[PDB]
Design a protein around this ligand. Structure first.
Ligand SMILES: Nc1ncnc2c1ncn2[C@@H]1O[C@H](C[C@@H](N)CC[C@H](N)C(=O)O)[C@@H](O)[C@H]1O
Length: 213
């Protein structure tokens, strides 16, 4: 009876606060960048790193039917949904949202969220959302927008319903800068976390050497 909501809250706390996983992965990715540089495959790459996590994490719950994460301690949740079921969830079609730099809060037009702050959220949650998307092109679009919304070393929680697909998702997301850091099987669901690596070039290379036709 493990809830995807309880699993997600548990990981986020471990990642930023109680186990400092973000520092463990930083060191792992720094070691990987040195291994690639030592093979002549990569040279000078831009690396952007997070400061010490705040006491209140900025979380974006996309496809948030009812804002399950709003009550969690130390999570400032901004909730979005195409068909909100509760009054605390904002109306929006994520596929049409602009990721804007230079803004602090969502900007609404006609009651629908149309602009969100870039590199502002420590976490973005896609809990059983991507399968509602029609095409694969639009699923990837959701993750590309999440990467622009995340801060350096922020995380994308991806929960999907229930092989070679999960390794193709790892490849396709590593190609946009998101490396998988956790995979767990809960009843009828598969819970994964993807991290905005210190360098996109780094993740793009890991993907190139892990593509299997
Ligand atoms: N293009 C879209 N833009 C915004 N929200 C969407 C879009 N397509 C589906 N949704 C919402 O994503 C939600 C999918 C739900 N199954 C997930 C609800 C909740 N996140 C959960 O973990 O159960 C629905 O409430 C949809 O309204």
């Amino acid at each position: 009876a493990r809830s995807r909501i309880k699993w997600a809250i548990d990981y986020i706390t471990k990642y930023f606060f109680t186990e400092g996983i973000y520092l463990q992965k930083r060191q792992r990715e720094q070691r990987l960048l040195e291994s690639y540089r030592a093979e002549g495959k990569l040279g000078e790459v831009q690396c952007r790193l997070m400061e010490e996590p705040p006491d209140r994490l900025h979380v974006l719950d996309v496809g948030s039917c009812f804002n399950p994460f709003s009550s969690a301690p130390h999570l400032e949740v901004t909730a979005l949904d195409l068909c909100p079921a509760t009054e605390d969830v904002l109306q929006a079609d994520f596929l049409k949202v602009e990721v804007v730099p230079g803004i602090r809060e969502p900007e609404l037009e006609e009651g629908s969220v149309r602009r969100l702050p870039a590199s502002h959220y420590e976490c973005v949650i896609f809990s059983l959302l991507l399968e509602y998307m029609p095409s694969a092109e639009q699923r990837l679009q959701c993750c590309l927008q999440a990467y622009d919304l995340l801060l350096p070393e922020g995380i994308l929680v991806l929960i999907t319903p229930d092989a070679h697909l999960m390794k193709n998702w790892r490849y396709s997301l590593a190609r946009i800068g998101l490396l998988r850091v956790r995979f767990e099987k809960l009843p009828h669901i598969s819970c994964m976390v993807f991290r905005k690596a210190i360098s996109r070039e780094l993740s793009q290379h890991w993907a190139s050497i892990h593509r299997e036709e």
